[model samples]
Target chain A: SGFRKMAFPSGKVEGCMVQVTCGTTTLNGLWLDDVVYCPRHVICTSEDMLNPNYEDLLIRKSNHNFLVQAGNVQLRVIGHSMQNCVLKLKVDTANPKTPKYKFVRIQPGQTFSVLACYNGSPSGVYQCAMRPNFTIKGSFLNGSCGSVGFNIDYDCVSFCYMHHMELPTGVHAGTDLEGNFYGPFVDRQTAQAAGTDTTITVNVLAWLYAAVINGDRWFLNRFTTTLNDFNLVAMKYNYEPLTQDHVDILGPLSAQTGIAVLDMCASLKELLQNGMNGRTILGSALLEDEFTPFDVVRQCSGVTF
Target chain B: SGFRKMAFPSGKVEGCMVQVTCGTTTLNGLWLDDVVYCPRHVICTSEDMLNPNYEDLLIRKSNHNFLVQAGNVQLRVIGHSMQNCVLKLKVDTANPKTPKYKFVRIQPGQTFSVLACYNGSPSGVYQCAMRPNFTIKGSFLNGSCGSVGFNIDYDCVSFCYMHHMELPTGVHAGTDLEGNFYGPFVDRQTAQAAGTDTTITVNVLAWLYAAVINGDRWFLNRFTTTLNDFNLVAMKYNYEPLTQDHVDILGPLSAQTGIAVLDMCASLKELLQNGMNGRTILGSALLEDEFTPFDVVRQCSGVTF
Candidate 1:
C-alpha cells in the first residue's frame, strides 16, 4: 500500500514497490511505513535491520501475498533545468487487523521546508528513505509523491546529506593563487642590469636554499662554486664587509623566494628519486640515465607545477 | 762679432752676443783662414797655413765672450695675448775690420705670418712671440722682443722615452671617468611603484657589485640571500631573458651610470677572482674567475654586455 520513488540528474527515476492482492492469504502481523530521509544515513546502518517483516498472515510460501523489492535504485537528470525540487513519499503500515497510515512528506522547495522523518506502527521498523524529485520543464516545479512500507519492530530513521564538500586546508589551489607575479625586479631593465657578480651571489643563495630544503647534492656543488666566486670577487673589490643595505635587501628576498625554489627542487628530486627506485605507474621507465648535471639544474630550476 | 737684438711679446725679448775682442794681436795665417769662408773653387792646401795669433784673433781666448739672455730680454706673453706678433732683430755679425756693419735686420712679422707658424707646432708647446713695443705718454718704449722659448721638451721627451722604453706588462694608468646619473628607473612612476621585491633585488645587485668589487665579505652572504630570492621569483614569473634593449635603456636610466644589474654580476665575478688571488684590481679578477659555471651560464644567456 506504500511506495517510494527518487529522481536523479541523469533523468532516470527509481524506487521501492510492494503490492497486496485479494483472495490471497493475508499477512497477519505485517506493518508498512514510509521513512523520508537522506540515503547516506540509510546506507550507514545494517541492511537486515533496515528492512524487516514479521508477517504470517499468508499461508502460501511463494504466492503474491507479500511482495517487496529493495535494492539500489538510480535516476539521472539532464541539463540545468530545475531551480529547486523536493522528495515526498506516502506510507502504509496496514494489515488485515489494522488500518494503513500515510507518513510525513518532506518538501525541500522554496515554500515549505520539512525535516526528514520516518513513520511506522509499533513493532515495525522503517529507516530513512530518500524520495528525490525534479522540475519537469526546466524550472522550479513541485516534486512527485511516493510511498514506502515497513514491517513491525523495524527501526525508522531520517537524515540530511550534502552533495558537495568543502576542501581541506583552505589553501588556494593552482599557480599564481594570489593573482600576482612576484618578480624580483620591478622591470626587465633592472633585472638585466644586475651585475654578473650579483647574479653569482644570487645563484649561490639559490643553491644554498636548494641544499637545505631538498638536500640537492648537485646544487650543493653549484652553491660551492657560486660562494667561492662571490668570495673571490668580494675580496678583489676590497669589499671586506657587506654593508647593512646589502644585507637588508638581499637577505630576506633570497631567503623567502629561495624557499619556494627549494620547494620546486624537492618536487623534482622526488620525481627523480622515484625513478631511481624503479617505481613506475604503468610499467613505463621514468628517468633516463643520460641526465647530466646541466639537465639536473635545468630541471630543478625550471619547475612550474 | 755677432750680436742680435729681437723684440718679442710682452716687451720680453732675448739677444745673443759673441765678441772676439783681441784686436791688438797679430792674426796668424791659420786664424785668418779659420774665420774666413773661402770660395769652394779656392782650395787652401796645408802649406797655406799661417802661424797667426789664432787664440787672440779667432778663438779670442783673452776676451772671448758669448752672452745669451732669454728671460731677461724676452717678454713673457701669457695666454692668447701673443697670438700674432712680429720679431725684429739686428744681427751684428760683421767683423771689426768690416766697419762693424749690421749684417741682418729682419722684421719677421711682415715676412712670415706668426699665427700660421705657431699652428704648425704641436699642441700645448711652443707659441709665437710678438713684438712688445707700445708707445705711452709719447715716449718710445724699449720693449723686449724675441722668439718665445717654450721648451716643452719634457712632454715630447717623455713620449720619446716611452717609445723606446718597454712598459711593464698589464700596467696602465686609469683615468677617473665621470658620467651623469639618469634616474632610479625610466621614469618617476617606476621608482614610486617599485615594490619591496624589486627594490631588494636592485639593492642586492648593487650590494653584490659593491661588495665583490670592494671585497666586502660580510655583505656577500646577505646579498647572496637576496639574489637567491630574486632568482626564485624571477623563475616563478617566467621572466623573459634579458635583451640588449634592456641594457641599453636601463644602463643609462638607472642610478648608476654604465652599470646594469647584469653588468654588476659580471664585474663582481671579476672582483671576486681578483680578491681571491690577491689581485686588487677588478678587471683581471673577473677574467681569472671567468670559467665558473654560474658565470658561464649567465654570460651565455642572460646578458649582452
Candidate 2:
C-alpha cells in the first residue's frame, strides 16, 4: 500500500510504483536525503551487520519499520525546509544511557558525529552502544498533518579495509548455502584434499560501503590496487558485482546527495570489471570493443583503472 | 587600513590586527566561507602558479583588489543570505568566450563546476580559460550600500601527486636564493663532492593544496607513506613545515569550513614531526619527551602515523 518517492529541492519528485523490501539489509550508519524511501519495511542499522552504510535502503510505507540496528554511530538530522519534521526513532538496549526499546520523537536539527575519527559534533561522542538496536519508525510528520522532509547525516566510519583476501584463519571463513566458499585458506592442496568447490569471491560490498559510501579514496584506491596486485593469483577472479537493483536505488541521486566522486568511480570500475569478465553491461552490450571502460574509469579516478 | 574579519553564522567574529600580504599567492581554485580577509591587499587566483587551491588566500579590499589570476577554473558563488549582493568580478582574456579583463557585475546564485573531472555543473563547463585574469574588485555590496557575507565553492582538481621526488630531469631542479638545491639529480656522492648543502626539501604544499585543502585523503596518505618509504635515503631529511603564520591564517577555521578529517590528521602529524625534529610546537614547548607524539596521531589516523 506504500510507495517510494525521491524529491529534490527543485520540487521534481520521481519514484516507482513497486514495493521494495530489504529486510535482511543492515548498516553501520545511513544517509537519507530528501526522500521518502522504504516506507514501511524495517531497515536494521549498524556496522556489525557487515554493511557499513545502507545506501541501498529498502522500505515499505508502514509505521514503525526503520529499525536502528545499533548505535555504533551517532545520527544527525538536518532540516532544509521551513516546515519542521518529527523523527520517530526507537532506541534499543544497546546503550544503557538511554531508555531501552523506546520510541523518541526527535525534532530535527540535532547534530551528532562519528565517535571514532570524523569531527564536528557539538554534543561530543553521543553514546549509542552498551544497549541494543535503535529503531526508526513512522513517516515524516509536520505540525499541519502533512508529511515533512529531512536529510540524515551520520558516521559511516567502519570496515576500513576489505578483508576478503586478508581475513584471518577463522574470521569470515564460511560456506554459503550455495556451496560458495569464502575466506582465508591454504592453496590448491587444501581445497583439492577436501574435494570442495573453492569459490574465490572478492566481496566488494566492504569496499562499496566503507570506501565509496563514505567517499574515502584512500581505502577505495587501496582496494583497487591491492586487488590488481593479486591478479596473477586470481586468474579468473570471481566477484558478485552489486545488483542493478542497488544501483537503481542509489546511483541516480548519489552525485547530488553526497557520494559523487568515489561512488561514481567505483560504479564505473564495476562497469569495467563486468566488461573484462566478458560480460557486457546493459547499455554497453552492443558497443562491444568500441566502448572502452578503462577510459571512463581513468576519467573518474585520474589514473590507471 | 581595513582589517580581515571572519564571521560565523552564530554571530562570532574574530580577527587579528595585521596587514597580511600574499601577492605571490596564486591558485587554480579558491574556497572562502564567511570571511573578509586581507582587507587592503590584492589576492591573485590561479592554479598553474604551483599553488592549486589557495586555502591561505590573502586578501586586501581596496575597492578593486581580489585579482582572478586566470580562468583555469570557473567560479561558483552560492548566495546564502536574503540580501542579494553584487559580485564585482573582472574576467581576463584567458578565455575569449567572455570579455577580456573587463569588470562585470554578477549577482549571486549562478553555479559553475570543474571541467576536467568532477561533475555537477548545470550550465555544462562554462569556458573560462580563453580570457586573462579574473578579478574581484570591490567589497561585498548589498542594495543598501552595506557589506554582506557569502561562501564560495569552486574546482580544486589539480596536482594529483607530489612531483618533488618525481620531477623531470630538468623540471623543478634548481637552486633557490639560499643555495638550496631542488629536483632530480644523482645521489649524495654528487652533492658532497660538489660542496653544496643539499637541502632535501619535500614540498608538502602540493599535498596541502591538492589533497588537504580539497579533502582528498588518498593523496594525503600517499605523500605520507611514500615519504616514509624513502626514510633510509633521506636521513635527517631537512624539510620546511608550513609556517605558524599560514597555520594561524587557515588552521582555526579549517575544520569548521571543510578539510576536517585529513587536515586535522595532517596538522597533528606536523605537530608530531616537530616534536621528533627536536623542535617544540608553541603550546607543547613545555611537554618534552614525557609527551608521546604518535598517540594523538594514531588516534586520528586509526592506524600508523
Candidate 3:
C-alpha cells in the first residue's frame, strides 16, 4: 500500500459528481476524497484496474452545478466543493508562441503546487499566489534545528470557516478559485529551507471559530492542533503567530450583514457546533462518524429557503 | 523627524477607530481607516507646543459608555470615542501584592498595546494578535528589495453607508464597545518595517465586498494593497495564505467562508459603511457629512436607548 508514485490528470475537469459504492451499497465521503473515508476503509478503487479512467470509472454524471472560470488559466469548482476531478495543467511558460507544455497530475490525497514566478526582475510581481496553490496534509513534524523554539506539529485539520474549503482531507487535491490544485508544505526540503528539523506530514481554519465558541472538546482539540501547525509551518518562511489565539469558549454573527473574520468564524463555529453535538439535517445523515463544517453549511449556504 | 521608536502591533485588530481633518477644516477622509478612503491628506499629527491633562478635560462626564472586560491588564476607553484623552496603562505585572506598578502612557493617535502574558509556565504562548487590534491605515508600503513588480496602485474614493462612524478626522480618536480607543497605523516604523518602500497604510475591510461588487476603483486598489500586505505580513508572522486567496474582483462569500479576507473585511466594512455614507435617520439633505458610524451605535448603545 506504499503507492506514492506519480500519476496523470485523467479525471473529469468540470462540474462532476462522484458516488461511492461497493457493488450494491452506496457510500458517502465519496466526495471527501481522503484515505479511508466512509465506514469502509477503502473508498476510491478502480473497478477495472487494468484500464483506469476516472470518468469511465467514478463519475456517473456531469452537471452544471459547478462554476468554471476560464482564462489563459481555468478553474472548475462547485460552490466551495472542489469535488473529485483530474486537472490538465498545461503550462505555456517558456514560449508563448511555439510554447512549452508541462503536464502536472494529482489524485485524492495528493498535492501539486501551482505557483508561477519570474525572478531577477527589476519591478514586477515576485511571489504572488495567483497560480500558487499551496496545501499540505498529514502529520508533519518540525523543530528549530540550530535554534530551539520554532517548529510545526501536524497538518490534519483546518477550521477557519472563512476559508475556501475544509481542506487537505487526506490529500483531496482540490483546485483553488483560480483553478489551481493545492494542499500543505509537508516536504523534507522545507526542513532544508527552514534549516529546521521538520519531518512527516499531510493536512489542512474557520469552522474552528464555531468550534472554539461552542467549546466543543473534540473539535477544539483537533482545531487547536491544525492551528498550531499552521503557525509553526510559517516559522520556515518566518511567518509567526497565525496560530496564536486564546481558545475562548464564544457569537453574534447572525442578522448582521458585514462582519470580520473573527466575528464570522466565531458565529459559523456556533452553528456548526449543533451538528458536532449530535445535530444533523439529513445532510448526508445516511453516513455516520463522518462530518465536516461544510455539512453545517448546507443550512447556511442560503437560498435553501 | 527621528521618532520611529514606538511600536505595538499591526494589521487587523478589534474595536479601534480613527479620525482625520485638514488644518483649514477640509475634512474628507473619515472611514479612511477603510480601503482607500476619501482623499486630501494631512492625516496623523503630533502637535508639540505643550499642554495636557485630558482626564481633567473630557473626564467631566466619564459615565461609562464603553464596556470593560476587566482583566489583569485593564484598558481605559471612552464611549464610542476615546474623545481625545491620555490613557495611563498600569500593569501590576511582577507582584500581585504591594510592590510595583509599571505604568505605560499613550496620548490620542498613539498605540498602547493591550496585551498580557503569563510567565514561568511549563510552556508559554508566543506572539498572538488575540488582544490583537489589527489596524492598517493608508500610506503603508513594502518592497522586495529592488523588485519593480512588488507594488500596489491607489483607487479613487469610497462611499460606504451603514458604517459605525465617519472617521480619520485629524484627532477623531474614538473608543469602541470593548473599551479600546482606536486609530490608524500610518506610522513611520511600519514603513520601515515594510522596507524603504511601503508608502500606504490606514485601512479596514468588508464594505469592501460591497465596493468590489459595485466595482469601486478606490477601494479595490488599496484593497489589493492590504490583501498583499496582509498575506505578506502573515508570512512575517506565521499566518501564511491561511488568509490568502485569489484577488477575485467579486463577492457574496457564501461558498468559502475563510476566503478573500477582503470579502469578509468588506462585509464588515459595509456594516461600518452605513455609518459612514451619511445614512443616519437624520438625512443626507439634512446634516450633510456630519454622520459618524460610532454616533449611530451610540443611540443603539443600550444605556442611551
Off by over 4 Å in 1: A1-200, A217-242, A249-305, B1-305
**Interface RMSD to the true structure, each candidate:** 55.5, 22.7, 27.1
Instruction: Order the numbered candidates by DockQ, best leading.
Output: 2, 3, 1
lDDT of each residue in A88-139, candidate 1, tens digit only: 1122322222223222323211011111111111110112111111110110
After superposition, the stretches of candidate 3 with alpha carbons farther than 4 Å from their true spots are A1-255, A258-305, B1-84, B89-135, B138-305
Task: Kindly list the per-residue Cα lDDT of model 1 for residues B88-114, writing each as its tens digit.
Answer: 112223222221111122211111001
Scanning candidate 1 chain B in windows of ten residues, the lowest lDDT window is B157-166
RMSD of each: 47.2, 21.1, 25.2
Give the CAPRI class of candidate 3: incorrect
How well is each residue in B3-43 modelled by candidate 3, as lDDT tens digits? 00111111111111122222321111111121111121122
TM-score of 3: 0.18
All candidates in order of lDDT, best leading = 2, 3, 1
Q: 1 or 2: which has the higher lDDT?
A: 2
DockQ of each candidate relative to the true complex: 0.00, 0.04, 0.01
lDDT of 3 at B114: 19
Which of candidates 2 and 3 reaches a greater TM-score?
2
TM-score of every candidate: 0.11, 0.23, 0.18
